[PDB]
Design a protein around this ligand. Structure first.
Ligand SMILES: CC1=C(/C=C/C(C)=C/C=C/C(C)=C/C=C/C=C(C)/C=C/C=C(C)/C=C/C2=C(C)C(=O)CCC2(C)C)C(C)(C)CCC1=O
Length: 309
């Protein structure tokens, strides 16, 4: 077995292809229209769901930058939004590039609030009734909420400077009591211990279960190899996630390796159970019961939760 061949481990599982397709569409817009799409897509989403406050302590990690953006002309604030959206090399764009996913999301969230108060100039958006942006809007609204918030996350993860260590990491309260999940059809300790570690916010215990040369493939992303790179990834994107697998199958294969497919929902700290992402986990364990490979898939539809062999 090789990482390349373990990527195919249950090949019938079907994924939300519309996510990268819709990001590719957003990429074809000019900056004026990328901003107009962000403003409207967020306002439209805010008809059903509003992201939860990320915390005073988390947002205090960027207090310096927030003070700058407040002691700044409406014209300066406008220019910053354009600079972040256009991938410009300015001081705050360079800083933004060292925010982790949640800090980037939190940066935008805290500006949203001050927009409501007039303390920050709104989105300086080109027109949102532009045909090009109206078409990318239609594509977003045609897909489920888990896909919409994923598209919205991607466009925000891709703003500011592109520099090819010092990443700001939001931390969040553990959600609930000891049994946060129960998996029908899977008692494999390594699988259970992974989900327990993630829900406990203990990413060292989660990565401890990986082989020295093991890998983690996030949704729509390349595999991440070895405990150091996996642990750094998870210290960013794993924070505040609650993982609610409910069913799966275990299979022994060649050389005393085992395969496991587990399905359920994942809840972001931002939306809680308002957006239950339908997720599969595909694990290849070597004979020592260690994780050689695990893929995480945003599933195509709720029907995929029941596709198990
Ligand atoms: C932009 C903007 C604004 C605001 C914009 C705002 C506030 C936008 C807010 C958007 C937010 C908060 C979206 C968040 C998305 C979260 C996702 C998709 C996470 C999924 C994680 C998963 C599946 C994790 C899975 C995983 C599992 C299960 C593992 O087991 C392994 C790890 C892994 C992590 C991979 C304004 C307010 C200013 C208006 C205009 C404007 O410009």
């Amino acid at each position: 077995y090789t990482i390349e061949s373990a990527r195919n481990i249950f090949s019938s599982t079907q994924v939300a292809d519309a996510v990268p397709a819709t990001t590719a569409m957003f990429a074809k817009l000019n900056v004026d229209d990328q901003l107009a799409f962000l403003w409207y897509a967020y306002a439209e989403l805010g008809r059903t769901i509003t992201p939860a406050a990320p915390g005073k302590a988390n947002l205090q990690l960027m207090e310096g930058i927030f003070n700058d953006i407040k002691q700044m002309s409406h014209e300066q604030q406008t220019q910053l939004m354009r600079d972040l959206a256009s991938n410009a090399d300015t001081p705050i764009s360079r800083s933004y590039a060292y925010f982790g996913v949640n800090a980037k999301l939190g940066f935008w969230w805290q500006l949203g609030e001050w927009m409501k108060q007039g303390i920050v100039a709104p989105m300086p958006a080109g027109y949102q009734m532009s045909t090009q942006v109206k078409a990318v809007l239609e594509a977003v609204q045609r897909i489920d909420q888990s896909q919409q918030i994923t598209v919205l996350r991607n466009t925000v993860v891709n703003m500011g400077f592109d520099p090819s260590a010092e990443v700001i990491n939001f931390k969040f309260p553990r959600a609930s009591l000891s049994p946060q999940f129960t998996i029908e059809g899977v008692t494999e300790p390594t699988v259970l211990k992974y989900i327990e570690a993630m829900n406990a916010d203990n990413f060292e215990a989660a990565v401890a279960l990986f082989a020295n040369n093991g890998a983690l493939q996030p949704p729509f992303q390349k595999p991440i190899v070895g405990r150091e790179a996996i642990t750094a990834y998870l210290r960013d994107e794993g924070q505040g996630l609650v993982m609610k697998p409910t069913k799966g199958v275990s299979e022994t294969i060649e050389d005393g390796y085992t395969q496991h497919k587990v399905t359920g929902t994942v809840e972001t700290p931002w939306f809680g159970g308002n957006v239950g992402m339908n997720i599969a986990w595909r694990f290849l364990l070597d004979p020592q019961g260690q994780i050689y490979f695990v893929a995480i898939d945003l599933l195509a539809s709720p029907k995929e939760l029941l596709n198990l062999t």
